Amino acid sequence: DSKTQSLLIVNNATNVVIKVCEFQFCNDPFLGVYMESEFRVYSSANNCTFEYVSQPFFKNLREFVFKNIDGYFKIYSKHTPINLVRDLPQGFSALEPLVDLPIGINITRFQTLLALHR
Amino acid sequence: NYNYLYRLFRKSNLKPFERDISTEIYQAGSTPCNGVEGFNCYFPLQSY
């Protein structure tokens, strides 16, 4: 809510964006594709403290680990081609480090954001 | 100069490298803070 600061990470299939602000969240947030046509993410955004963007860049599996270590937000990533439907494919392979950030917010709850095709 | 402030009240300690920028009313007793300042409900910011 607007009472405390919060972290938003979003991808628009071409850019990855990180925002660290005292957002007021729309409690039913989603993205909608008709090419995108719905961007219900936040009710309000003010008092920004950090913002970052990137360059304009079942079938596949992407695994990540998100953790917090005394103000250091750590993000680890790995990607693999997967053709199965419901199993967890054994054959464990080594993960890798991706990102560290000094966002430094009190994180206790989290949610995932989707894209709905309409 | 009173453009500098410091927080006076918080219900718990802080972790290192934590940015405590909240301005909520602090409950100093058993009386709830019903969204308004009052006795034992001081504003947790003070002016240098």
Q: Does A5 touch chain B (CB under 8 A)?
A: yes
Task: Give the SS3 label for residue A82.
Answer: coil
- Asked if A105 has any chain B CB less than 8 Å from its own CB, the reply is yes
Helix, coil or strand: residue A50? strand
Among B16, B19, B24, whose Cβ lies nearest the Cβ of A3?
Answer: B24
Shortest CA distance to A40 belongs to which of A22, A25, A18? A25
Angstrom distance (rounded) from CA A57 to CA A37: 19
CA distance B20 to chain A (A): 9
> What would the two tokens of residue A43 be?
């009710």
Helix, strand or coil for residue A89? coil
A38, A28 Cβ separation under 8 angstroms: no
- How determined? cryo-EM
Interface list for A 7-26 with B (CB within 8 A): 22
Verify whether the Cβ–Cβ distance A3 to B17 is below 8 Å. no
Closest CA relative to residue A107, chosen from B23, B11, B15, B44: B15
- Resolution attained, angstroms: 4.0
